[PDB]
Enzyme design. Structure first.
Site, PDB file in Angstrom:
ATOM      1  N   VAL A 196       0.863  -1.174   0.000  1.00 21.66           N
ATOM      2  CA  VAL A 196       0.000   0.000   0.000  1.00 21.66           C
ATOM      3  C   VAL A 196       0.892   1.213   0.000  1.00 21.66           C
ATOM      4  O   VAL A 196       1.617   1.418   0.951  1.00 21.66           O
ATOM      5  CB  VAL A 196      -0.843   0.093   1.261  1.00 21.66           C
ATOM      6  CG1 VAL A 196      -1.325   1.507   1.455  1.00 21.66           C
ATOM      7  CG2 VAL A 196      -2.003  -0.837   1.182  1.00 21.66           C
TER       8      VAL A 196
ATOM      9  N   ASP B  18     -12.330  -9.708   8.568  1.00 23.43           N
ATOM     10  CA  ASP B  18     -10.965  -9.457   9.027  1.00 23.43           C
ATOM     11  C   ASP B  18     -10.795  -8.214   9.891  1.00 23.43           C
ATOM     12  O   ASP B  18     -10.025  -7.355   9.545  1.00 23.43           O
ATOM     13  CB  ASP B  18     -10.098  -9.323   7.783  1.00 23.43           C
ATOM     14  CG  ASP B  18      -8.612  -9.398   8.053  1.00 23.43           C
ATOM     15  OD1 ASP B  18      -8.223  -9.841   9.133  1.00 23.43           O
ATOM     16  OD2 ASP B  18      -7.811  -9.025   7.162  1.00 23.43           O
TER      17      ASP B  18
HETATM   18  O1  LIG Z   1      -6.312  -2.460   2.672  1.00 19.36           O
HETATM   19  C1  LIG Z   1      -5.287  -2.666   3.290  1.00 19.36           C
HETATM   20  N1  LIG Z   1      -4.732  -3.888   3.418  1.00 19.36           N
HETATM   21  C2  LIG Z   1      -3.341  -4.079   3.798  1.00 19.36           C
HETATM   22  C3  LIG Z   1      -2.874  -3.139   4.917  1.00 19.36           C
HETATM   23  C4  LIG Z   1      -3.450  -1.767   4.717  1.00 19.36           C
HETATM   24  N2  LIG Z   1      -3.048  -0.592   5.172  1.00 19.36           N
HETATM   25  C5  LIG Z   1      -3.902   0.384   4.691  1.00 19.36           C
HETATM   26  C6  LIG Z   1      -3.796   1.820   4.971  1.00 19.36           C
HETATM   27  C7  LIG Z   1      -4.788   2.701   4.554  1.00 19.36           C
HETATM   28  C8  LIG Z   1      -4.642   4.040   4.841  1.00 19.36           C
HETATM   29  N3  LIG Z   1      -3.596   4.479   5.518  1.00 19.36           N
HETATM   30  C9  LIG Z   1      -2.611   3.692   5.925  1.00 19.36           C
HETATM   31  C10 LIG Z   1      -1.468   4.306   6.664  1.00 19.36           C
HETATM   32  C11 LIG Z   1      -1.196   5.682   6.565  1.00 19.36           C
HETATM   33  N4  LIG Z   1      -0.214   6.255   7.212  1.00 19.36           N
HETATM   34  C12 LIG Z   1       0.597   5.552   8.008  1.00 19.36           C
HETATM   35  C13 LIG Z   1       1.666   6.163   8.701  1.00 19.36           C
HETATM   36  C14 LIG Z   1       2.479   5.394   9.494  1.00 19.36           C
HETATM   37  C15 LIG Z   1       2.264   4.014   9.641  1.00 19.36           C
HETATM   38  C16 LIG Z   1       1.241   3.396   8.994  1.00 19.36           C
HETATM   39  C17 LIG Z   1       0.397   4.154   8.165  1.00 19.36           C
HETATM   40  C18 LIG Z   1      -0.653   3.543   7.477  1.00 19.36           C
HETATM   41  C19 LIG Z   1      -2.693   2.330   5.662  1.00 19.36           C
HETATM   42  C20 LIG Z   1      -4.862  -0.194   3.930  1.00 19.36           C
HETATM   43  C21 LIG Z   1      -4.588  -1.559   3.943  1.00 19.36           C
END
Ligand SMILES: O=C1NCCc2[nH]c(-c3ccnc(-c4cnc5ccccc5c4)c3)cc21
Length: 259
Positions: free
Chosen positions: A33, A135
């Site tokens: 991602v 999940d």
């Molecule tokens: O759909 C998914 N499946 C796999 C794991 C995941 N993370 C996300 C996600 C979505 C939106 N934002 C984040 C995110 C944003 N910013 C971050 C900053 C520091 C650490 C983690 C972070 C995750 C992760 C979506 C999914």
């Protein structure tokens, strides 16, 4: 007549509209991602890439349908593009800087209730439009910003399914409530789960209400057919009257540091 808009699958190259980086925000079945940037607005977003099959086309649907709920990571646009001569579906969602639920903690009952309460709404919304998330692990609960008034938001619809299953969402809710209060799962395994074999051992849980313990016990019933419905979870006092819960303190941070 409050109609929100329908789902539009953009065909232009996503690179026309966003700058894509290689910062990785998360791992999952379909690879990474990525953090990307809206060109017009220089704002940050998360990008999820799927191979365009009908499974992919089903996530995007449900998620998109689910997106207009304040406690669920919101989709901002969806593209269909070619990549190595392979149709892909690019999901551009709101970027959630606050990182995973627990990590934030490792830095109060009542604080716990509020969290459970918000995660509740996420499920409640889903369930009322007939979507089971499945999940609901804690990796999939991220905060919007490090700012400690940030909103907790559920993500990752890789396993969402239509219900035109839900009882197993409430399980997760119970497991997450567990870990919030004491600091570890109820399961320290495949056999102890099927049995419904778990303690509220002390002095970790000694200070915790029988009100609360009941509730968890009702969420973690081995037999789905009478685990608590989300509609009842939300009606249960601990969650219902959120802020009038005692600000009684708990070791959760210490334990999730220790462990
Ligand atoms: O759909 C998914 N499946 C796999 C794991 C995941 N993370 C996300 C996600 C979505 C939106 N934002 C984040 C995110 C944003 N910013 C971050 C900053 C520091 C650490 C983690 C972070 C995750 C992760 C979506 C999914």
């Amino acid at each position: 007549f409050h109609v929100k808009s329908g789902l539009q699958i953009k065909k232009n190259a996503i690179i026309d509209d966003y700058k894509v980086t290689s910062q990785v925000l998360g791992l999952g079945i379909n690879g990474k991602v990525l953090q990307i940037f809206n060109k017009r607005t220089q704002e940050k977003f998360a990008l999820k890439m799927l191979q365009d099959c009908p499974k992919a086309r089903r996530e995007v649907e449900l998620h998109w349908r689910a997106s207009q709920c304040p406690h669920i990571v919101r989709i901002v646009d969806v593209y269909e593009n070619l990549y190595a001569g392979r149709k892909c579906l690019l999901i551009v969602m709101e970027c959630l800087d606050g990182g995973e639920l627990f990590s934030r903690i490792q830095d109060t009952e009542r604080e716990a209730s509020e969290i459970m309460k918000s995660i509740g709404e996420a499920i409640q919304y889903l369930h009322s439009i007939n979507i089971a998330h499945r999940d609901v692990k804690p990796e999939n609960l991220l905060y919007t910003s490090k700012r400690p008034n940030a909103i907790l938001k559920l993500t990752d619809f890789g396993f969402a399914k239509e219900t035109t299953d839900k009882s197993c969402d409430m399980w997760s809710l119970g497991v997450i409530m567990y870990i919030l209060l004491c600091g570890y799962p109820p399961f320290y395994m495949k056999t102890r789960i099927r049995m419904g074999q778990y303690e509220f051992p002390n002095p970790e849980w000694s200070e915790v209400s029988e009100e609360v313990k009941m509730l968890i016990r009702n969420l973690l019933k081995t037999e789905p057919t009478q685990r608590m419905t989300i509609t009842e979870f939300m009606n249960h006092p601990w969650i219902m009257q959120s802020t009038k819960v005692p600000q009684t303190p708990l070791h959760t941070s210490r334990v999730l540091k220790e462990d």
